[PDB]
Design a protein around this nucleic acid. Structure first.
Ligand SMILES: [Mg+2]
Ligand SMILES: [Mg+2]
Ligand SMILES: [Mg+2]
Ligand SMILES: [Mg+2]
Ligand SMILES: [Mg+2]
Ligand SMILES: [Mg+2]
Ligand SMILES: [Mg+2]
Ligand SMILES: [Mg+2]
Ligand SMILES: [Mg+2]
Ligand SMILES: [Mg+2]
Ligand SMILES: [Mg+2]
Ligand SMILES: [Mg+2]
Lengths: 100, 100, 315, 46, 95, 52
RNA sequence: AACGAGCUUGGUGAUAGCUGGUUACCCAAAAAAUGAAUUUAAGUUCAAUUUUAAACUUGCUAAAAAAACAAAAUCAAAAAGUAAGUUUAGAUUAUAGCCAAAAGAGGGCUCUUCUGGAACGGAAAAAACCUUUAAUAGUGAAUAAUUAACAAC
RNA sequence: UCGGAGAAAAUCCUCCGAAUGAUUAUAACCUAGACUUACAAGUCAAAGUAAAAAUAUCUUUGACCCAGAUAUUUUGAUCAACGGACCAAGUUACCCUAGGGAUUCCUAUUUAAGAGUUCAUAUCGACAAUUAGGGA
């Protein structure tokens, strides 16, 4: 079964706190073929919020998207057609969270 | 083989030029355009080629086309693509041959 | 599935043809290429319906109609409009008035008398031989008292030197009411003279309402006049000079070919050699020659030769 | 496949701050360009 | 072919060319269509008509046939009643 | 199988043309155009040419 | 004195689509290793390229709508930046590529498509990555790329 | 060798057929302009003329030479190695010449259901994790 970065492999619910289900889900995640993590509703929300916050408050004038789209530096000679959509976040089958 | 459009829309086409070759009726004969046995499209006049859509009405004699046409919903009619050559010159001119 | 399906071929055809007329986003072939009368009308109908004899003939499919009665009634009701279609179809309004269109309203009638027994009528688009048009035609158009008129007869495409211009045949001016003999003969009557092999020429009769009598001294022509340089005449500019008092109301036109009488006209009175024309089609297209016409028959050489006779050069 | 590229039009729509930075009026635009080559066309598409 | 013959020291014509092709003096070569006499019972009428025609040769084919024949076959022949009298010359040829 | 047969004009001309006939069927006879007579005449089978 | 068939002379300068070699200077241009047929794949002929000369006229980049498709190339009005192009005459060689980066298909290779490269500078040494319009003399100058980077509450 | 279909313009990629017959209203000659194409071969066709008083309808292949059959017109290939030598198989370790070549279970970490009387990690250890190293 293929799986893409960002997918939720398995879901749990009930009258339990995240802390209760933290350990087992993290253990189960560790043994999954790809990197994975255990996230509650709040944590995934916080995860997206931090990503959007990073983009807004970025102090670097230059960004991968602008350079790639405008062909600045003649850069698209060295880039794949898919890179324009990804915007540098995704390389091969790997996801780089720190990349804005 | 090499089936396709020999002459595109907007081209000057002489009397006998072949416009398109087709295994199936991808295009249909229009005005001043004839049909070959192999279903190829050739001009019948010197002019400019045009491709235009128009409603299709079949010969009454053929049963299958009439039945499909009648079975169409009352709301609308089916369409097809037709090929046209717009004659670019007059049939002839009158000139003074002799004075008596 | 909700909509019904055409159960007959005709329903689709009628839908299709109406569909074709409507304009569409996609490119298509067409782009490139009073109350009292109503009440009286109804009353007559009811009487016709009541008539048993009418029913019996209809069910016996032996009934008939009088054409003459319909024609006269058609003239009163919508003959002006149908006549307008023919004038536009024949190009009269574009060649005469530079695109201006006038509905004919006076039921103009013209006929060329053949001997005395019968007279050839001149309807719209009719065919009359030049021999039949040798003498001037009788004109009755039901003017009514007063309301002076001017009758103008011209061949639109008969000019031999200038394409736009046309040749006057006869012009009657200050025509008072019905009587036409009381008109000043500015232009004497000339027989039609369409050149041989020049196709069909369209000749039209133009009737203009005259508010007040105006002397057309400029348009007067010596009688008889046999000069084509003086018969040249433009309707469009002429109507501009008299548009204040001239408004067209009548039409009648016919098509005529060349004829033996035309030979008489060109020689006897016009006193010139008759012009003869022939329809010439353009030379056939042949691609530019190749020094090596690879994969071409022996006929290839004949396509680009001019003379069919041998030549020997130095020999 | 390396192919000719079509730039989105937004790139060539300037911002008010850009005019201040480069000191060019959006009205009364300049007439003639001064263009110099500062890189090589070797290793660039034909 | 033979460029220098033992007896005369001359070029020799390839007679198989002379037996299949006609040279017009202008420089063109004529030929028949291969198979025009073969299995006519299964060929379409239009196909048979195409086969019956006399056809010209290309520039390279003409160049080869020129090499394979000697000058004698390239001369002017004044045959009385020649049926190719008109086709030994080119008319209105701009190129 | 099928055989190729030579149909001969019966108008007295030597004109003939080859047609294909199924060996089980009777000898073929056709109306065909004779160029030497410029008319449509009967062509009657005269000989078998080959077996198709 | 090396016989699956002796030795010598002659035929004989046997033949060899195979290996090897093929002798002064200067200037200019330059393919590509693609498609087709072949007892053809160690070769050849044709196309295609390239080239010399000549003739006379539009070519290259771009290219709206609009069609053709399904709901980035083909076609190419006007323009603009620019100087090539078409045709005739003559002619060989070539017809095994290599590596990098993209898109696919067979499943790291093996193929097909598209782009680039062949430093005397740089990446240590370095055909293929990056900087680099030719060729010069000078004990001048401004620059390009440029293997480096700054453990946990 | 060729044709049909998918991948989709690649493939030792995956399928179906053809070396056809049937059907007949019998389907001429002549001739612009084009397709396809190294060459060869293969397609479509206005106009004109002529027969008749709607085309043939289904939907393919073999050149040249050379032999036939006729009263001019026709016919000859599993030439299938399908651009086709008119007609020729094995074997060589006795060999020769010209060249081109080559010469899955471990082991270490992470995880820990179960084994271990009781007790996960004294000793081991399923399901898995490691850009972790090794062996027609
Ligand atoms: Mg010895
Ligand atoms: Mg030798
Ligand atoms: Mg070889
Ligand atoms: Mg062979
Ligand atoms: Mg242009
Ligand atoms: Mg450094
Ligand atoms: Mg050919
Ligand atoms: Mg015809
Ligand atoms: Mg072979
Ligand atoms: Mg072969
Ligand atoms: Mg082939
Ligand atoms: Mg032994």
């Amino acid at each position: 079964t293929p799986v893409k970065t960002g997918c939720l492999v398995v879901e749990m619910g009930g009258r339990c706190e995240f802390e209760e289900v933290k350990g087992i889900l993290n253990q189960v995640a560790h043994k999954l073929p790809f990197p994975a993590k255990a996230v509650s509703r709040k944590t995934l929300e916080r995860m997206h919020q931090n990503q959007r916050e990073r983009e807004l408050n970025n102090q670097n004038p230059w960004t991968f998207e602008h350079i790639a789209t405008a062909n600045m530096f003649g850069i698209r000679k060295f880039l794949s057609p898919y890179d324009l959509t990804q915007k540098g976040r995704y390389w091969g089958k790997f996801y780089m969270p720190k990349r804005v | 083989k090499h089936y396709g459009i020999k002459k595109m829309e907007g081209h000057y086409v002489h009397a006998g030029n072949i416009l398109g070759t087709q295994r199936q009726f991808r295009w249909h004969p229009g005005a001043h355009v004839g049909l070959g046995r192999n279903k190829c499209l050739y001009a019948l006049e010197e002019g400019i080629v045009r491709y235009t859509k128009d409603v299709y009405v079949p010969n009454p004699k053929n049963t299958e086309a009439v039945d499909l046409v009648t079975s169409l919903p009352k709301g609308a009619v089916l369409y097809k693509t037709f090929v046209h050559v717009v004659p670019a010159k007059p049939e002839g001119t009158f000139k003074l041959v002799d004075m008596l | 599935e909700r909509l019904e399906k055409y159960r007959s071929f005709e329903r689709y055809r009628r839908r299709a043809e109406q569909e074709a007329r409507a304009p569409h986003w996609w490119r298509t072939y067409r782009e490139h290429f009073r109350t009292q009368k109503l009440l009286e009308r109804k009353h007559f109908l009811r009487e016709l319906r009541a008539n048993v004899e009418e029913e019996r003939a209809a069910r016996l499919r032996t009934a008939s109609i009088p054409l003459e009665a319909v024609r006269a009634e058609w003239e009163r009701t919508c003959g002006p409009y149908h006549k307008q279609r023919l004038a536009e179809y024949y190009g009269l309004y574009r060649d005469l008035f530079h695109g201006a269109t006038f509905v004919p309203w006076v039921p103009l009638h013209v006929a060329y008398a053949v001997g005395e027994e019968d007279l050839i009528p001149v309807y719209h688009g009719n065919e009359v031989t030049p021999t039949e048009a040798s003498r001037a035609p009788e004109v009755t158009y039901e003017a009514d008292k007063d309301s002076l008129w001017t009758l103008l007869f011209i061949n639109l495409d008969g000019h031999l030197l200038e394409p736009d211009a046309e040749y006057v045949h006869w012009l009657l001016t200050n025509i008072p009411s019905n009587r036409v003999a009381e008109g000043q003969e500015t232009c004497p009557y000339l027989p039609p003279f369409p050149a041989r092999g020049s196709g069909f020429h369209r000749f039209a009769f133009l009737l203009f309402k005259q508010d007040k009598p105006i002397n057309f001294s400029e348009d007067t022509r010596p009688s008889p006049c046999y000069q084509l340089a003086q018969r040249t005449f433009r309707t469009f500019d002429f109507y501009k000079r008299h548009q204040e008092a001239m408004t067209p109301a009548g039409l009648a036109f016919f098509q005529c070919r060349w004829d033996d009488s035309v030979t008489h006209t060109f020689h006897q009175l016009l006193d010139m050699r008759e012009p003869v024309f022939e329809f010439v089609r353009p030379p056939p297209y042949h691609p530019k020659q190749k020094r090596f016409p690879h994969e071409q028959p022996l006929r290839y050489l004949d396509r680009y030769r001019d003379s069919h006779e041998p030549t020997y050069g130095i020999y | 496949k390396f192919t000719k590229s079509r730039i989105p039009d937004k790139v060539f729509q300037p911002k008010p701050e850009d005019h201040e930075k480069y000191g060019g009026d959006p009205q009364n635009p300049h007439k003639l360009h001064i263009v110099t080559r500062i890189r090589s066309t070797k290793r660039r598409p034909y | 072919l033979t460029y220098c013959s033992t007896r005369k020291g001359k070029r020799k014509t390839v007679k198989s060319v002379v037996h299949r092709f006609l040279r017009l003096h202008s420089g063109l070569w004529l030929r028949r269509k291969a198979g025009y006499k073969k299995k006519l019972w299964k060929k379409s009428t239009a196909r048979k008509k195409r086969l019956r025609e006399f056809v010209f040769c290309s520039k390279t084919q003409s160049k080869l046939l020129d090499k394979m024949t000697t000058s004698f076959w390239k001369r002017r022949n004044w045959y009385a009643g020649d049926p190719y009298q008109m086709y030994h010359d080119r008319t209105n040829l701009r190129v | 199988k099928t055989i190729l047969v030579k149909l001969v004009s019966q108008a007295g001309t030597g004109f003939s043309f080859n047609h294909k006939r199924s060996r089980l069927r009777e000898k073929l006879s056709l109306l065909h155009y004779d160029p030497i007579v410029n008319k449509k005449v009967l062509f009657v089978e005269q000989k078998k040419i080959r077996s198709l």
